Design a protein around this nucleic acid. Structure first.
Ligand SMILES: [Mg+2]
Ligand SMILES: [Mg+2]
Ligand SMILES: [Mg+2]
Ligand SMILES: [Mg+2]
Ligand SMILES: [Mg+2]
Ligand SMILES: [Mg+2]
Ligand SMILES: [Mg+2]
Ligand SMILES: [Mg+2]
Ligand SMILES: [Mg+2]
Ligand SMILES: [Mg+2]
Ligand SMILES: [Mg+2]
Ligand SMILES: [Mg+2]
Ligand SMILES: [Mg+2]
Ligand SMILES: [Zn+2]
Lengths: 133, 50, 188
RNA sequence: AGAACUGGCGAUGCGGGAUGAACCGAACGUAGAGUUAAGGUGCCGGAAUACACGCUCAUCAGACACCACAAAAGGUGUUAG
RNA sequence: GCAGUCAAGCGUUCAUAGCGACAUUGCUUUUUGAUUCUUCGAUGUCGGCUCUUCCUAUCAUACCGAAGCAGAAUUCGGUAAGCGUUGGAUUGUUCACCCACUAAUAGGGAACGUGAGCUGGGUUUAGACCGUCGUGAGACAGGUUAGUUUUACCCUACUGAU
């Protein structure tokens, strides 16, 4: 349930990447298995960027969240990308938050900064985020 | 609007249908005008709305 | 079976003059003049008097003879077109969204616009052919009248208006909305 | 795949079937002239764009034995009965 | 494997919206057989990888017809091969089977395309082990492990260059 569109951002999280869990749902990391809205090309790995919704599995954390597939939203990206104002920027790590298909967050708090692109696209992430960029 | 509904019915509802190519045909037609089915004479009325 | 001779008769009123030469037909009447090119049928026109004209086919098959009666009908339609004219009436049919029809001018082309067809935001434009006049009848709700001397010009102009208002991706038996020809007659 | 009778190919060129061991015509010394076979005579291509009565219009017409394919079932297309 | 004809019946009523028994006519060479014409003074043999083009019996996209088509969703059919038809776990696999994304994850041909293009996991030399069989040497369209992949400077084709 994206609330608008998003200008293209450099992809840095292909399938198989592991990112930190930025919420308090009890999970510690997220293992990306798919990207929503990705295209098709032979041998090309689906990849995600800031603000994308992915399908992920929890590898470390509460056992009730393990061994299952759940949606997730990327909120920080270590790969540098260029904004339309001419600025190249990047974060120190890759992080995500567990969400349902409608975009509602499973947790209730977010630790660390959140990208501006993600906050605008997902209103629920913006509500639980403390500092944007 | 029975008068206006009847007027629109003769163009949209009162038709025949070819059983081989689904072509829309006049209600009094005996053969289909299409060459794909060989001008077959197997026709059925167009089904009415409920 | 190659009939030896097949004949048809064409009647002419008092005020109408007909000039035929090399299968070119011009009909002049009180309401104007019409011209038709018929150099694709191979018929022979002959004049009996000022009130009767005959057209015949010699040594013609079933298919060739069938076109002889068509020639008579086309010439007869021209004769009454310049004497009585043709008048086609259409009615607006809709369930919920009213249909707004108005005449507009675009670079001197005399178009006619249809607005709010099934709530569509798109504007539908239909050109108005030469010799065809469009009026909106009084004391009858949602009626448009097309008049002219040529029956083909009036009929095709009305047909274009009907096809421009066809429903897509819906059950046409339920969504009976559009503009349909309701009466065919003469101006007089 | 296996038999019967005959004619062939194999052992065989020549004219014809565009092309082909077996089909059609015809079997062979070296030449000239005449006439034909099977097959052909719009142009390629030698030879009537000959004559005569009909049939056929196909938005995948049809066009010659062996032979290089088409059926059941249908059409108020057209023709005759 | 794919497509027709006929219509007893199914479909609340109603043969033919969508289906359809008993019968019957075909098409295809992407299955497997039948045959043994070509090659045993040798046409490199499974699959994958890479890359081009072709077929339509059309999965998606464009425009339409039909419905037991109210809407939404779906189903049947037409013109259409222009344009696309994927990422992974197990298996040498073709095949198969799940996970997931997607407008969609359609089926096929090109010497069952493609080894002087690769790769060599499998099959199918010689080493070795096991089970059953054999007195034995040994056998097994049973399992298991280790096992050399050669040459283009010629002609043509193609790509560029005089
Ligand atoms: Mg011998
Ligand atoms: Mg031949
Ligand atoms: Mg000559
Ligand atoms: Mg033999
Ligand atoms: Mg070779
Ligand atoms: Mg060799
Ligand atoms: Mg091969
Ligand atoms: Mg090799
Ligand atoms: Mg090769
Ligand atoms: Mg080679
Ligand atoms: Mg090996
Ligand atoms: Mg060995
Ligand atoms: Mg080597
Ligand atoms: Zn039909």
């Amino acid at each position: 349930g994206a609330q608008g569109t998003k200008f293209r951002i450099s992809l840095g999280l292909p399938v198989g990447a592991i990112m930190n869990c930025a919420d308090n749902s009890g999970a510690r990391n997220l293992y990306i298995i798919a990207v929503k809205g990705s295209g098709s090309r032979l041998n090309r790995l689906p990849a995600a960027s800031l603000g994308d919704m992915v399908m992920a599995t929890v590898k470390k954390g509460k056992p009730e969240l393990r061994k299952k597939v759940m949606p997730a939203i990327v909120v920080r990206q270590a790969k540098s990308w260029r904004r339309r104002d001419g600025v190249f920027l990047y974060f120190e790590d890759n992080a995500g938050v567990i969400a349902n298909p409608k975009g509602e967050m499973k947790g209730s708090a977010i630790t660390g900064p959140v990208g501006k692109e993600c906050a605008d696209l997902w209103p629920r992430v913006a509500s639980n985020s403390g500092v944007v960029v | 609007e029975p008068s206006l509904k009847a007027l629109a019915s003769k163009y949209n509802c009162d038709k025949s249908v070819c059983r081989k190519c689904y072509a829309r045909l006049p209600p009094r037609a005996t053969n289909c005008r299409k060459r794909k089915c060989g001008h077959t004479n197997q026709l059925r009325p167009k089904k009415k709305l409920k | 079976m190659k009939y030896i001779q097949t004949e048809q008769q064409i009647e002419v009123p008092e005020g109408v003059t007909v000039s035929i030469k090399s299968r070119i037909v011009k009909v002049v009447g009180p309401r104007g003049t019409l011209t038709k090119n018929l150099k694709h049928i191979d018929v022979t026109f002959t004049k009996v008097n000022n009130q009767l004209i005959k057209v015949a086919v010699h040594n013609g098959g079933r298919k060739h003879v069938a076109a002889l009666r068509t020639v008579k009908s086309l010439v007869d339609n021209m004769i009454t077109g310049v004497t009585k004219g043709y008048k086609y009436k259409m009615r607006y049919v809709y369930a919920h969204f009213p249909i707004n029809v108005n005449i507009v001018e675009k670079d001197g082309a005399k178009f006619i616009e249809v607005r709010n067809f099934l709530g569509d935001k798109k504007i539908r434009n239909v050109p108005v052919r030469d010799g065809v006049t469009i009026e909106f009848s009084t004391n009858v709700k949602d009626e448009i009248v097309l008049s002219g001397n040529s029956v083909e010009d009036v009929s095709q102009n009305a047909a274009d208006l009907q096809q421009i208002c066809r429903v897509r991706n819906k059950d046409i038996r339920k969504f009976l909305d559009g503009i349909y020809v309701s009466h065919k007659g003469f101006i007089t």
